[PDB]
Design a protein around this ligand. Structure first.
Ligand SMILES: O=c1ccn([C@@H]2O[C@H](COP(=O)(O)O)[C@@H](O)[C@H]2O)c(=O)[nH]1
Ligand SMILES: O=c1ccn([C@@H]2O[C@H](COP(=O)(O)O)[C@@H](O)[C@H]2O)c(=O)[nH]1
Ligand SMILES: [Mn+2]
Ligand SMILES: [Mn+2]
Length: 176
């Protein structure tokens, strides 16, 4: 009856000062649907053309090459379906402010008066939840994988769908 969408993004990078997303772009969105504590398998996964370069640090994390993104859709091209997918759900995101910041930024660039994500989705920060559950402990997604015996062996490089799927498993266990 209620949908949870476990979501992750990869980006061109991030700013350590000021708005973390300014001047950066989402290059991958990965989102997995959970209904009644079961993955439905109906997911959303896109790579996006950023029309700027990936910062070396970000490339160190996700390995998504500039060349790979050249033929991909723009955020504008996926935004409608993305909104249709997430609307009304509880979004579960590890360090939610990061991705939500990027999402609202990208939505805002569309100049379509799209309201903030948290006005049409519930936003749950699984990192805050993990910190509450495991105060004083490591709470990276990888740390949580070890804690909950979730396979992250394929996660040498981070990817948005990969990370969202891993987080969904972790979060189900956290709330189970
Ligand atoms: C470090 C860790 C993460 N990121 C950026 O944060 C995004 C999300 O990383 P993650 O939260 O999915 O690990 C990455 O795509 C990357 O651009 C960095 O720049 N350096
Ligand atoms: C944002 O949130 C990410 C959390 O990574 P993970 O713990 O979900 O792997 C950081 O890498 C930062 O870029
Ligand atoms: Mn992430
Ligand atoms: Mn990721």
């Amino acid at each position: 009856i209620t949908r949870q969408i476990v979501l992750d993004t990869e980006t061109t990078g991030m700013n350590q000062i000021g708005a973390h997303y300014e001047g950066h772009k989402i290059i991958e969105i990965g989102a997995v649907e959970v209904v009644n504590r079961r993955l439905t398998g109906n997911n959303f996964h896109v790579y996006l053309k950023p029309d700027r370069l990936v910062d070396p640090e970000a490339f160190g994390v996700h390995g998504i090459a500039d060349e790979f993104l050249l033929d991909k859709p723009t955020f504008a091209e996926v935004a409608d379906e993305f909104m249709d997918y997430i609307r009304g759900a509880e979004l579960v995101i590890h360090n939610a402010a990061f991705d939500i910041g990027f999402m609202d930024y990208e939505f805002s660039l569309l100049k379509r008066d799209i309201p903030k994500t948290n006005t049409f989705c519930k936003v749950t920060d699984s990192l805050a939840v993990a910190r509450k559950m495991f105060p004083g402990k490591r709470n990276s997604l990888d740390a949580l994988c070890a804690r909950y015996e979730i396979d992250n062996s394929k996660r040498t490089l981070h990817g948005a769908l990969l990370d969202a799927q891993i987080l969904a498993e972790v979060y189900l266990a956290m709330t189970g």
